[PDB]
Design a protein around this ligand. Structure first.
Ligand SMILES: Nc1nc2c(ncn2[C@@H]2O[C@H](COP(=O)(O)OP(=O)(O)O[C@H]3O[C@H](CO)[C@@H](O)[C@H](O)[C@@H]3O)[C@@H](O)[C@H]2O)c(=O)[nH]1
Ligand SMILES: Nc1nc2c(ncn2[C@@H]2O[C@H](COP(=O)(O)OP(=O)(O)O[C@H]3O[C@H](CO)[C@@H](O)[C@H](O)[C@@H]3O)[C@@H](O)[C@H]2O)c(=O)[nH]1
Ligand SMILES: [Mg+2]
Lengths: 333, 333
């Protein structure tokens, strides 16, 4: 038996004017009239019973998370008192399993079209877990010097497709990322992890006692004791808090197309640049990503530009600045 | 006395999405909820009777012109069967004056806020016309190497502020326009002209006979006889037909600020760049010009950009390419 832990803490700000501050990233229907989370949950339910799926998410989002995922038990959504990043959410979650039990940690914010290959990889990671223990990550081959992704160096090969992690470095500078990619000895951290519960808990004790010490005796369904416990706990990701530090990290190579729905360029990577139609007019404008609504849009003299038009507003953004659309949300509110 | 000839033949395509292809530039209300033509007419009625004012325009715009200018008698709107640019229009309008009567030729697409300084200049030109004859221009001091204007080379003084023209060059290439400015020796042609009716006609006779040969004996208010003549007549601007060639051209420096309403860049020159408001959010974007309709527009990571939103559509244009909004209209229709 295994558990799945779904981390829903999203920041849909970057996706304005689709997203309002009301709709967290997780509930955005970027594809197929289905939220990121819903697609993620349907993917899990292909091989898993809802009983064994957990979602860790801030309390405001609980009531909606329930509406979105009616199959889930109520006891299975854990209400957090504060947004403390992934490490505390992982710990709190992993505690809900039996010491022995494998836990698959999954972000809600990803896109993975191939469910079967996804499970093919998970299965292959599980046998790995049983054979070698330690903490497992899923490596994606890099196609660019991305600065918001973690980077895993490949090490001693355990078996075909499975290696020890020589090192792990989260969110590096650009030129370093560039060198990692030029190297070939690195893969992107997918953001999904697999570990046995007891082992991960012991690694956090060593790696980040501040977390371990103040959360070890806590009941995740007692909101009050979890509130007061979180007051002593920091905001920090599993990656910084444990993976960079831990010497028992493993990586399996993901055999599936993967994407982090990070900002609008991200969506363009999936769909491709927009072509001229009756409602999109391009004069001296190349590599242009445009979403119309009621009326036509004309882009003149511009390239590598993103334009989005909803009832909420109109975004005109240069591609290298897609991450700064969050700032639009600071100013506009 | 004196006549005024307003030329109304303009294409508003560069002011999409404000303008529809149905509407020409003359009927656009860029300022004060009055049409470019309407401002031009009111400027002229400051010192003239409607009866001495003549508009020359395509037959398709006549009914619409009467509604805009109800003070204008119907006989003073000369319906043209085709657009042949300004040389033929000037000819048929000027014909209607008497041999010795000076004719003031005015585009409909100018913005001249100081009516009084305008007439101060016309007065000074009328006087100079009596003393020196020939064809008059009004020179603006050039701020930039504009390729869409005519350039007047300043020659000998007749008297202070009034000069013979050493050279009139219409629509030079960029590098010539840059040299013209550097030299200090040139003025922009305002597009307005003043001449005695008989003198202009002889000047077209020598400069561009096609126009004279075919229109000399034609009653401009006899539509069918004008229709037949215009099949034989070329489409050519007064500036290329006569002004570049003539040896009888003088210039009076304009005592007034002036502006040709060429494209959205022009409107920005008048109004200045947009600043941040409720409906206009700017992030890493300077020198932006933004007009909103019902929604917030956010511009991220872009400078020197025009964004215009209206029920007809949305325009996103880099400033340098403001001419090319024309090509948007052609693709869109
Ligand atoms: N409950 C909870 N969830 C959170 C919190 N912070 C983040 N999450 C959730 O954890 C996941 C990661 O959030 P991101 O903000 O997307 O992290 P990241 O910068 O994308 O970086 C991580 O994932 C990358 C790929 O998606 C990795 O490359 C990187 O190494 C790291 O694991 C998302 O599902 C998000 O909803 C939190 O404080 N509380
Ligand atoms: N009746 C009629 N009028 C016309 C036609 N074509 C143009 N016009 C009118 O003639 C005037 C000048 O036309 P534009 O098309 O704006 O001319 P331009 O290229 O701006 O160039 C002229 O003006 C510039 C500055 O205003 C000058 O710099 C340049 O030398 C030239 O005189 C405008 O009022 C326009 O309505 C036509 O086929 N028929
Ligand atoms: Mg003009």
């Amino acid at each position: 038996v295994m558990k799945a832990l779904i981390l829903a803490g999203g920041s849909g700000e970057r996706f304005w004017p689709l997203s309002t501050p009301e709709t967290p990233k997780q509930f955005l229907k970027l594809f197929g009239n289905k939220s990121l989370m819903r697609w993620t949950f349907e993917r899990v339910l292909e091989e898993m019973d809802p009983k064994d799926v957990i979602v860790v998410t801030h309390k405001d989002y609980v009531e909606r998370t329930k509406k979105e995922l009616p199959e889930l038990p109520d006891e299975n959504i854990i209400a957090e008192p504060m947004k403390k990043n992934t490490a505390p959410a992982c710990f709190i979650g992993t505690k809900l399993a039996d010491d022995d039990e494998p836990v698959l940690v999954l972000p809600a914010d990803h896109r993975i079209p191939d469910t079967k290959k996804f499970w093919k990889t998970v299965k292959k990671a599980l046998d790995a877990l049983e054979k070698y223990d330690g903490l497992f990550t899923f490596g994606i081959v890099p196609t660019r010097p991305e600065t918001g992704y973690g980077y895993i160096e490949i090490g001693e090969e355990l078996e075909e497709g499975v290696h020890k992690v020589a090192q792990f470095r989260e969110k590096p500078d650009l030129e370093t990322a560039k060198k990692f990619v030029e190297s070939g000895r690195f893969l992107w951290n997918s953001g999904m992890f697999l570990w046995k519960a007891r082992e991960f808990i012991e690694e956090v004790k060593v790696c980040e006692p501040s977390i371990y010490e103040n959360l070890k005796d806590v009941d995740p369904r007692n909101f009050e004791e979890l509130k007061k416990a979180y007051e002593k706990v920091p905001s920090i990701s599993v990656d910084y808090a444990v993976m960079e530090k831990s010497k028992k990290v493993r990586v399996v190579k993901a055999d599936f197309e993967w994407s982090d729905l990070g900002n609008w360029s991200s969506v363009r990577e999936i769909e491709g640049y927009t072509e001229e139609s009756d409602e999109v007019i391009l004069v001296d404008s190349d590599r242009v990503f445009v979403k119309t609504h009621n009326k036509p849009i004309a882009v003149v003299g511009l390239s590598d530009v993103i334009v989005i038009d909803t009832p909420n507003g109109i975004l005109i953004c240069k591609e290298e600045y897609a991450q700064k659309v969050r700032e639009v949300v600071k100013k506009l509110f």
